[PDB]
């Protein structure tokens, strides 16, 4: 089974992807996590991607398409989490999979109002070393676990990221709807309730 998680930044896609991958045996492909690793390592991809990420912009399509070609699991279940982010990326994904006799089975849209998004992101804290994600209100980190607020989770960059999402990424909703594979998730609910709905729509 191949899944795509789609929706505004802060919707809880990474949180649910980690949960589903671990419980139901999926390979979790997070372009965000993979890019952040590239940046930390100072690879050619990382050095180029860094400036876009810092500004809240999307990394150029060709870079991301190449990355996915490089890391796509040949066999097994996959969750694409944060990819595709543009129509060109979605078209490239369809082409890649078709060459392998595969397809995207379900696209889950994590629906959540802008106001909730802003609250999710502004309160997001991460463990810089493990990438583990917390929320100052909804899932506070234990004391003694060192967390930070990501620079791209500050008000100005959140605003940009949501604008970029609406312009470039939201059209994927209609792209996938017309393939018949879109399922709707109310991502505004608490974490366990959202997870139950994720299990429901793919079962
Ligand atoms: N598929 C992609 N295409 C282009 N850029 C991407 C992609 N995935 C991640 N990025 C870059 O990494 C940043 C963080 O991505 P991600 O971790 O998916 O988002 P979020 O902060 O909403 O969880 C994005 O704002 C963008 O700069
Ligand atoms: N259902 C939920 N209710 C409340 N907070 C959540 C929920 N899901 C995730 N969060 C918190 O919201 C923030 C964004 O979650 P994340 O998984 O990083 O979203 P995305 O990957 O869609 O950008 C994080 O701080 C996370 O702890």
Segment holding 186, helix H or strand E: strand 182-186
CA atoms within 13 A on the CB side of 34: 20
Nearest ligand 1 atom to alpha carbon 85: 1
Kindly report the protein residue whose alpha carbon is nearest to atom 3 of ligand 2. Answer: 190
Q: How far apart are CA 151 and CA 41, in angstroms?
A: 18
**Paired residues of 185 in beta bridges:** 110
Nearest to 53 by CA among 67, 69, 36, 70: 36
Instruction: Take residue 199 and report the two structure tokens written for it.
Output: 């299990």
Tokens of 190: 């608490």
Query: Does the beta carbon of 194 lie inside 6 Å of ligand 2?
Result: yes
The token duo for 124 is: 């997001």
CATH superfamily of 1-203: P-loop containing nucleotide triphosphate hydrolases (3.40.50.300)
Alpha carbons within 13 angstroms on the beta-carbon side of residue 126 total 18
> Using what technique was this structure determined?
X-ray
How many CB atoms are closer than 10 A to CB 133?
17
Length of the chain counted residue by residue? 203
Burial of 101 (0-12, 13-18, 19+ CB in 10 A): exposed
Question: Could you tell me the residue ranges of all domains in the chain?
Answer: 1-203
Phi and psi at 67, nearest 5°, equal: -55, -45
Residue 152 in tokens: 């791209």
- Residue nearest atom 21 in ligand 2 by C-alpha distance: 14
Is 13 a known ligand-binding residue? yes
Q: Are 90 and 76 in contact (CB under 8 A)?
A: no
Nearest CA to ligand 2 atom 5: 138
For this experimental structure, what is the resolution in angstroms? Answer: 1.4
**Ligand 1 pocket check: which of 37, 82, 91 to mutate, most ligand atoms within 8 Å of Cβ?**
82
Write the CA distances from 78 to 9, 20, 47, 57, 164, integer angstroms.
20, 10, 27, 25, 26
Mutate-to-test residue for ligand 1 from 35, 55, 62, 171, highest number of ligand atoms within 8 A of CB = 35
Q: Which ligand is nearest to the CA of 188?
A: 2
| Residue closest by Cα to atom 9 of ligand 2 | 12
CA 65 to each of CA 45, 59, 61, 150: distance values in angstroms, whole numbers, following the listed order: 12, 10, 6, 25
CA distances 153 to 61, 70, 118, 165, Å, are 23, 28, 9, 14
- DSSP-derived 3-state class of residue 141: coil
Helical H segments across the chain, by residue range: 13-24, 31-41, 44-55, 61-71, 87-99, 114-122, 155-164, 171-177, 191-201
CA distance 123 to 92: 34
Pocket test for ligand 2, best of 12, 58, 198 (most atoms within 8 A of CB): 12
Closest by Cα among 41, 40, 46 to 64: 46
């Amino acid at each position: 089974m191949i899944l795509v998680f789609l929706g505004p930044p802060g919707a809880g896609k990474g949180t649910q992807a980690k949960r589903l991958a671990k419980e139901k045996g999926f390979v979790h492909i997070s372009t965000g996590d993979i890019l952040r690793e590239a940046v930390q390592k100072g690879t050619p991809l990382g050095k180029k991607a860094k400036e876009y990420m810092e500004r809240g912009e999307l990394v150029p399509d060709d870079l991301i398409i190449a990355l996915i070609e490089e890391v796509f699991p040949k066999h097994g279940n996959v969750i694409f989490d944060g990819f595709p982010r543009t129509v060109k990326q979605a078209e490239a994904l369809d082409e890649m999979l078709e060459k392998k006799g595969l397809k995207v089975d379900h696209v889950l849209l994590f629906e959540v109002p802008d106001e909730v998004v802003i609250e999710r992101l502004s309160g997001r804290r991460i463990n810089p070393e493990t990438g583990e994600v917390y929320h100052v209100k909804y899932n506070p980190p234990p004391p003694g676990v060192k967390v930070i607020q990501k620079e791209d989770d500050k008000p100005e960059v959140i605003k940009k990221r949501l604008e970029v999402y609406r312009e470039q990424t939201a059209p994927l909703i209609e792209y996938y709807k017309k393939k018949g594979i879109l399922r709707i998730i109310d991502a505004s609910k608490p974490v366990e309730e959202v997870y139950r709905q994720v299990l429901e729509v793919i079962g």
